């Protein structure tokens with residue numbers, strides 16, 4: 354037989370090994386083991402959880418399939434507000450942004466450049482390493498609590514590597530290939546298609562039945578922390594490294610540019626690589642890298658003064 358005692362220990366072992374495999378596959382996009390190895394262990398875990406349902410834990414990989422059905426979403430306040438971004442549309446707009454930054458700071462300034470992921474802004478809160486809240490940006494100060502749905506998003510860690518208390522923010526999006534596939538499925542079932550993957554991702558995260566959301570193939574890129582916790586980064590480039598280090602999925606295409614000249618070249622570089630990417634972007638986000646200089650520039654009412662988004666038409 355398998356006793357409750359033996360199963361309690363073995364279950365944790367399985368959770369640890371499977372989540373590590375899930376990390377490599379969904380977060381690093383680089384699995385280490387063949388699928389059949391994962392499926393075999395996963396099946397063993399499912400058997401144990403079926404026999405002893407009390408052994409089911411929130412960080413168990415079986416829970417990714419969802420199950421809960423909400424009546425509605427609760428309000429999710431952001432005490433550290435989630436701002437939006439000021440826009441630029443021309444090479445002149447970007448150089449003018451740089452001129453304003455140098456005027457305010459008084460010296461040449463480095464920019465961390467990121468692809469602008471076209472999706473839904475999310476905030477992920479963790480207590481002692483445990484996922485405890487997921488939320489939409491909403492209006493910047495109050496969004497929707499979509500914790501249950503984001504449990505189904507495989508790149509989102511249910512328990513972090515270290516027991517750290519942090520809230521991080523990024524983009525949840527639907528990959529192109531999944532957008533294509535979902536719309537076909539809607540065509541088959543007599544449904545209106547989504548106009549674009551941004552809309553598909555937003556309609557997905559608005560679903561109240563978490564079982565549907567788990568089927569929707571959503572993914573994430575994290576790019577900032579609202580509350581730092583123990584985190585050590587002093588620059589945006591450092592933050593992105595640290596975010597990867599504690600277990601989040603980050604976008605590999607960011608670059609540290611030491612002149613506005615390098616910024617526009619980045620912009621031209623990816624303005625064309627755009628088509629080759631598995632996800633949609635609507636532009637590029639230019640951030641003053643040093644956090645000390647970001648604080649110095651501060652925020653307007655709408656947006657940070659230390660950033661600008663170059664939009665593609």
Ligand SMILES: NC(=O)c1ccc[n+]([C@@H]2O[C@H](COP(=O)(O)O)[C@@H](O)[C@H]2O)c1
Nearest residue numbers: 374375378384385386387388391392417
């Ligand atoms: N490390 C791996 O090879 C790995 C990890 C997670 C999921 N998968 C694959 O993804 C598919 C669905 O798995 P999950 O819904 O449990 O994530 C399965 O076919 C599974 O084999 C593979």
Ligand SMILES: NC(=O)c1cnc(OC2CCCC2)nc1N
Nearest residue numbers: 467468469470524576638657660
């Ligand atoms: N859509 C994106 O990919 C994206 C959006 N926003 C930001 O930075 C904002 C975060 C709060 C102040 C600057 N970075 C991004 N990469």
